[PDB]
Enzyme design. Structure first.
Site: not given
Ligand code: A1AOI
Ligand code: GNP
Ligand code: MG
Lengths: 170, 163
Positions: B54, B59, B62, B101, B112, B121, B125
């Site tokens: 990812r 941002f 990951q 997480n 990440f 965050l 985190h």
């Molecule tokens: C609303 C759109 N949107 C945005 C966003 C907001 C404003 C403007 N534009 C956007 C995007 C570009 O518009 C499409 C975000 C964003 C983030 C998420 C979902 C949607 C998002 C998201 C989903 S899960 C998460 N965030 C936390 C994730 N955890 C997991 O991946 C775990 C794994 C480690 C196990 N899983 C998989 C899990 O928790 N499950 C829940 C289930 O349980 C069984 C699975 C995690 O730690 N990180 C590390 C830190 C950054 C973060 N990912 C991430 O990707 O931030 C993306 C970011 C920063 C762009 C924010």
């Protein structure tokens, strides 16, 4: 005739939002879980003899990032409120999604359908009657679905289109 | 002194470049030790071969799911998950290394690398290191990302270890 609708799929993580969407769009199901950030799909369908483009926004179950999620709700014309029949928390979460939609769209009359997914699983924790009563209290349709067996998938999305069509032409 | 680890990043198997990290064992010792051991593979499992699944421009990058290879898995050296150690350090800008997480106290192996400040965050985190050398390689990885995180080519940790 030709029309187009912006449909938005919401609900807690893991309830089957993407699996439902991929069954409608691509007609297949896989057990593998690919967690959603955001995905958009377009499909041409015929519903009750009327041709339409469906624009489906498949949202992540997480509820942070209110600025983005509010915009999802301002733009969407109809919403599938998905819970899983074996996830009581996902059902308890439903009223939050509806409250957010009414707040953002400043309206008590927004096209929505309550969807109880994973109906194929023998691990039910949410009674059908509970969900029927909640949808009735909201004045919206309720449909039980399985993305695995495809039961109710077309009906769920087509019912939401009918709710939008009604709203637009009333 | 704080330990240093390296990732040799690959694009569809071809070397992209090396990224090295300082791990803040001095302030986040349990979390730093997990990442260190996973980088060397000394417990019999770890990051080598795993994917940055990812990557979202503006941002973060990951990665770290070496158990399921699909973004849902990973495990720590302490078991499947461990507690949030502390929140002393914050997501202050590019290069910050922090734990992914699924809610409180679910640290495993996914992590990440920030490509910008991500202060929302903070307190959710655990920050435990930072890029030392190779921010330009991290910037290259970022260019393979997209809005929903899917990468245009496959970005992997071809090799990793402790310096
Ligand atoms: C609303 C759109 N949107 C945005 C966003 C907001 C404003 C403007 N534009 C956007 C995007 C570009 O518009 C499409 C975000 C964003 C983030 C998420 C979902 C949607 C998002 C998201 C989903 S899960 C998460 N965030 C936390 C994730 N955890 C997991 O991946 C775990 C794994 C480690 C196990 N899983 C998989 C899990 O928790 N499950 C829940 C289930 O349980 C069984 C699975 C995690 O730690 N990180 C590390 C830190 C950054 C973060 N990912 C991430 O990707 O931030 C993306 C970011 C920063 C762009 C924010
Ligand atoms: N048995 C069964 N499994 C289902 C059904 N719908 C989804 N699943 C499974 O449940 C898991 C999660 O499904 P998914 O569609 O990704 O859920 P989601 O609501 O999109 N999750 P997210 O909010 O993270 O994007 C997957 O393993 C999927 O195969 C269903 O109707 N029946
Ligand atoms: Mg999904």
């Amino acid at each position: 005739s030709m029309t187009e609708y912006k449909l938005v799929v919401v609900g807690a993580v893991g309830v089957g939002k993407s699996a439902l969407t991929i069954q409608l769009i691509q007609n297949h199901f896989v057990d593998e879980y690919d967690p959603t950030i955001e995905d958009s799909y377009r499909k041409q369908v015929v519903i009750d003899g009327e041709t339409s483009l469906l624009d489906i926004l498949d949202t992540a179950g997480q509820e942070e990032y209110s600025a983005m999620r509010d915009q999802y709700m301002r733009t969407g014309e109809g919403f599938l409120l998905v819970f899983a029949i074996n996830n009581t928390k996902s059902f308890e979460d439903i009223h939050h999604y509806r409250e957010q939609i009414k707040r953002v769209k400043d309206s008590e009359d927004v096209p929505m359908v309550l969807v109880g997914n994973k109906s194929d699983l023998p691990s039910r924790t949410v009674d059908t009657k509970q969900a029927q009563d909640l949808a009735r209290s909201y004045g919206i349709p309720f449909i039980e679905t399985s993305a695995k067996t495809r039961q109710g998938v077309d009906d769920a999305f087509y019912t939401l289109v009918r709710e939008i069509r009604k709203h637009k032409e009333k | 002194v704080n330990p240093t680890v390296f990732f040799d990043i690959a694009v569809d198997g071809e070397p992209l470049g090396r990224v090295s990290f300082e791990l803040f064992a001095d302030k986040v010792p349990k979390t730093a030790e997990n990442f260190r051991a996973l980088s060397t593979g000394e417990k019999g499992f770890g990051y080598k071969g795993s994917c940055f699944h990812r990557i979202i421009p503006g941002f973060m990058c990951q990665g770290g799911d070496f158990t399921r290879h699909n973004g849902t898995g990973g495990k720590s050296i302490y078991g499947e998950k461990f507690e949030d150690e502390n929140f002393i350090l914050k997501h202050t800008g590019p290069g910050i290394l922090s734990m992914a997480n699924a809610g409180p106290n679910t640290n495993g192996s996914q992590f990440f690398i920030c490509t910008a400040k991500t202060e929302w965050l903070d307190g959710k985190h655990v920050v435990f290191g930072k890029v030392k050398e190779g921010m330009n390689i991290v910037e290259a990885m970022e260019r393979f990302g997209s809005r929903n995180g899917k990468t245009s080519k496959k970005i992997t940790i071809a090799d990793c270890g402790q310096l």
